[PDB]
């Protein structure tokens, strides 16, 4: 009936949850541990303030956040009805911050593009152009050295990252770094 989705900031300071469509109130029950096999309404809960945003979604902020507590949430609808509950473990919905201090260097004598900046990374690089044409490379390691068709061209490079275990979100792509030779 009503879907609630959540994301934890890369500083681990808060979790932001969103939902959209009587009077309506998000309630939550925090576990001392995690999420059960099957989420349920619990008699003990607290309300959250949610605010309607211009995209038509309500947004609610949990700050600070208990990263390893299961938050079961639902919408209380006025008799009263409860929407189907869902449970989230905040540490699993982290969106990491982007890799920072991205550097892109061509060394002529070596003949490679050197890029530098537990996680996996994707790198994308292309001729600095217009709408750039991106090639993409994946690292499962700090710094990588790729071949390029042209050692004298200027390339734009971005890196993003995600948990090595595949849980959570990808970061945004870093601010573009530009090669120097």
């Amino acid at each position, epitope marked *: 009936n009503i879907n609630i989705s959540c994301e934890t900031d890369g500083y681990l300071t808060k979790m932001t949850c969103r939902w959209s469509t009587s009077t309506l109130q998000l309630r939550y*029950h*925090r*576990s*001392s*541990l995690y999420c059960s096999d099957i989420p349920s309404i*619990h*008699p*003990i*809960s*607290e*309300p*959250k303030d949610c605010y309607l945003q211009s995209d038509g979604f309500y947004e609610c902020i949990f700050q*600070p956040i*208990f990263l390893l*507590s299961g938050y079961t949430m639902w919408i209380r609808i006025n008799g009263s009805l409860d929407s189907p509950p869902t449970c989230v473990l905040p540490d699993s919905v982290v969106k990491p911050l982007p890799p920072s201090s991205v550097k892109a260097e061509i060394t002529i004598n070596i003949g490679l593009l050197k890029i530098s900046w537990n996680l996996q990374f994707q790198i994308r690089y292309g001729l600095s152009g217009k709408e750039v044409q991106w090639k993409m490379y994946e690292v499962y390691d700090k710094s990588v050295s790729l071949p390029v068709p042209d050692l004298c061209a200027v390339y734009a490079v971005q890196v993003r990252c995600k948990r090595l275990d595949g849980l959570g979100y990808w970061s945004n792509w870093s601010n573009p770094a530009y090669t120097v030779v």
Partner: antibody
Amino acid sequence: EVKLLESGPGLVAPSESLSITCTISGFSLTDDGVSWIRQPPGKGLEWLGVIWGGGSTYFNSLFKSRLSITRDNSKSQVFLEMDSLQTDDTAMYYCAKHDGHETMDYWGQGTSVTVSS
Amino acid sequence: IVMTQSPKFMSTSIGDRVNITCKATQNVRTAVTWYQQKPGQSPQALIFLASNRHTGVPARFTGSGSGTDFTLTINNVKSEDLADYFCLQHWNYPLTFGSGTKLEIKR
């Protein structure tokens, strides 16, 4: 480390009021709830009420006509008030911290309250 | 919701094993916590969410059960276990406690 420490009056005369302060450290009152519980001589524990992290307060129906629980986050204090005490309100009085919405993880030292003329 | 502990007292010896039970008058799922209360002291948590150990509680304390029937088991009894043990349900309001079982130790 989490600590709770109650400060109360020791003695309350009949029909007068009980005020107790619970001073906490090692956590924030806005992240978790704090309850009040009492233990009368020779009897079972009795939960009186809670003030949750977000500030909502629930009382035991048996005491709602005469309880207040409030707090001052800035001073890390939670305050109990109970009005119109009588003899059978004599008890040890405790504050205790909650861990989310499923258990109480730490108790205070307790403060003895005797109601007597 | 009433949490009934039928044994008021139980007598054991050093190194034996003891079972302390609590029965709820309604379904409280796994939201049951066991506490130890030594003479002249505050309660301290042993087991929360029916079967999980509080920080620092030795492995010889275990808990089991769900629904209405719960058990704390103390293996390898030691002298410092001299105490009152009682349950809490933390499923709905009012929160309610069992009346306790006092552990007595033969020597």
